[PDB]
Amino acid sequence: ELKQDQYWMQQAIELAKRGLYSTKPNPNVGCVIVKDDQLIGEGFHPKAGQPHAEVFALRQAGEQAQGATAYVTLEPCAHYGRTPPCAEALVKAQVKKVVVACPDPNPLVAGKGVQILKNAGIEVEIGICEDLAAKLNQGFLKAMSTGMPYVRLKVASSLDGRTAMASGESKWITGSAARQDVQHWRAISGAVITGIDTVIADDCQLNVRSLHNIDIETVAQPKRVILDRRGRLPLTAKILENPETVMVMGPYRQELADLGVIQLEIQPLKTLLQTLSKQYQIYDVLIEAGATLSSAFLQEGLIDEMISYVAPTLLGQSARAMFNADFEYMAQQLRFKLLDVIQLDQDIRLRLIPTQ
Amino acid sequence: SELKQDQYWMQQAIELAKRGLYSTKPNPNVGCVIVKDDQLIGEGFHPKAGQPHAEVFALRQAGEQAQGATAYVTLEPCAHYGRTPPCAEALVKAQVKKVVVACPDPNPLVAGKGVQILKNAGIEVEIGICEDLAAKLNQGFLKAMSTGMPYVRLKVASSLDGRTAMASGESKWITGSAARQDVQHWRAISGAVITGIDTVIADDCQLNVRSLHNIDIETVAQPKRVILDRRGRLPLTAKILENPETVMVMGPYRQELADLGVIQLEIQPLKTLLQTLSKQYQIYDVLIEAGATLSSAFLQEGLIDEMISYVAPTLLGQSARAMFNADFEYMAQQLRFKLLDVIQLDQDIRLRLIPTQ
Ligand SMILES: [Zn+2]
Ligand SMILES: [Zn+2]
């Protein structure tokens, strides 16, 4: 009966995943309506500006929603935003019970939806499959509760922890399946951060161009954030193809204004992350940068999760180190907790969380 | 579905053959089932060199009923009197109708002669059934018998950034205990573990098999420990010597070593050393547990069949000791591998890798 609740929530968790690339800055939310042990309404949130999962499920439910039980992965909202309050829609639909996975992470609003629900004499349960549900909105839950984005760092290295022989060669040690995987990480990110070096060396794009069974046009594209402190970004760079989705931290440049590039002031990495969240509503950040900037992020403790692609090759000791720090003692190691390792054809990928 | 019926029974035989993986060397892992009217009537594996063969055990169980039965066996039944009588003769004596064989036995003492003994008695022989699966059961033995070179697994452990110690040489607790315990398995199927003198002085390692998940260690046919020591620096107090009878040293002849019972090997190139271990000492599976230099030399000389790489979820930084210490100037020089698989061992991962050659 708790297990019954958990079963229904998991369904809502699965529906929530259906807007994964298209919801940002809004969260992923799923909702099921259950009447007499029967599924009678399903909804997810497809896109910021569109109806919330609850609205879509209640539409399906119809007058049948009366006395039913709604399961929603995130507390139903109580405030008008782009759309009306779900708490009220659920009051209007005259449901018996609401089962919530994640309370609203915004502490100014946490419980407000519950309060409306409880005052309408609707019973409420919170925390069911919270852990699983929270995996749907790592950036969102983090940013709304702490003001900082969830930051993922992508690194690609050899078996022996190296990335290149020489810099600026644009050589690849990882294969195409790993390329495909990177797309997923970009597609859930509000921004992809890199340093001018990568741009100059690689003419990289850092956008989302192919995801299996999804058309590009449905994807809420990450902003491309370039850290360019000396303003050496050439106007010819492929990244400037879609200038509206480019941010550039570096000296004010009139030529970049004329293209509509967002120009950010030079600020500490930590502050940059704060600015992206607060000003631009970027809650998921991905770093795809060379060793210096990657190492800086890691050493400044700014990485929530490292996504490490390892190619089955040895580059040898004089090849470029993936990580630039000069540690003297074993006690100085940056240890991580391993989440999982998967195979991507010839490469593997690890996801790693800092420990303390 | 005759082919399907055969594969079913052979797969059974292949399962029996996994039952003495640690105890068989230098002898092969071999499984055998005996099937009569689709009933399993006899079962056997080879437990240990000097002990009877899978076939004998399987035949003993089947008894009189083996007459007209089909024997499934993962390796060609043997044809010679070795430590024991020939199994092909035993199959002939039991009057089996048919013998289905996974792998031919390239052991020159057998090599088609068991098959031939059976054919000559009018027993049907089919060969090749689940060969690829069965071959996995004796990578070393089959390689050694048919080429004179052992199967060589290179073990390395490193941080994510490819480092094995600090610049000082401090190195404790990079990989964790599950990885360490996995190494036990690799040691236990190996005829020899090869290390260099530097490892012995630095770690005072033993490189034996001391624990194995859910296995009585008494069953383990211990690897020999092979120490490369060009200049004879091996201290007599080294822990690796507390069991001298299973140590071999490649270095200058020392009478104090001869007196402990240590096999002394002539200084020779690595390829030759590997052939020596195969042709002279019946070592068909080799595990290298050595430092950067010796490890890299085996790799660069093309002497590794499989690399087993343990990676810890940690970063030691750009000044820490490299796990692989060649210096390549060009990207084209990179040493490429094919990935067999990766698994998680608590917090470490383990990659198995086959050199691209
Ligand atoms: Zn809502
Ligand atoms: Zn035999």
Author numbering:
A (entry chain B): 3 to 358
B (entry chain A): 2 to 358
What do the study's own words say?
We selected a bifunctional enzyme, diaminohydroxyphosphoribosylaminopyrimi­dine deaminase (EC 3.5.4.26)/5-amino-6-(5-phosphoribosylamino)­uracil reductase (EC 1.1.1.193), called RibD, in this pathway as a potential target in Gram-negative bacteria. In bacteria, the second and third stages of this metabolic process involve zinc-dependent deamination and an NADPH-dependent reduction at the ribosyl group, respectively. RibD is constructed from an N-terminal deaminase domain, which carries a Zn2+ ion, and a C-terminal NADPH-binding reductase domain. The overall structure of AbRibD is an arch-like dimer and most certainly not a uniform globular entity.
Crystal form I, the apoenzyme, belonged to the orthorhombic space group C2221 with two subunits (A and B) in the asymmetric unit. In form I this was assigned as phosphate since 0.9 M ammonium phosphate was used in crystallization and in form II as sulfate since 0.2 M ammonium sulfate was used in this case. The interactions of the phosphate group differ in subunits A and B. In subunit A, the phosphate accepts hydrogen bonds from the side chains of Asn28, His54, His81, Thr85 and the main-chain amide of Arg84. In subunit B, the side chain of His81 points away from the active site, while the side chain of Arg84 is now within interaction distance of the phosphate. The loop between β4 and α4 differs in position in subunits A and B (crystal form I). This is a well conserved sequence that includes Asp106 (present as glutamate in a few sequences). In similar fashion to what was observed in the deaminase active site, the oxyanions phosphate and sulfate were identified in the reductase active sites in forms I and II, respectively. The phosphate interacts with the side chains of Arg188 and Arg211 and the main chain of Gln207. In subunit B, an additional interaction is formed with Arg181.
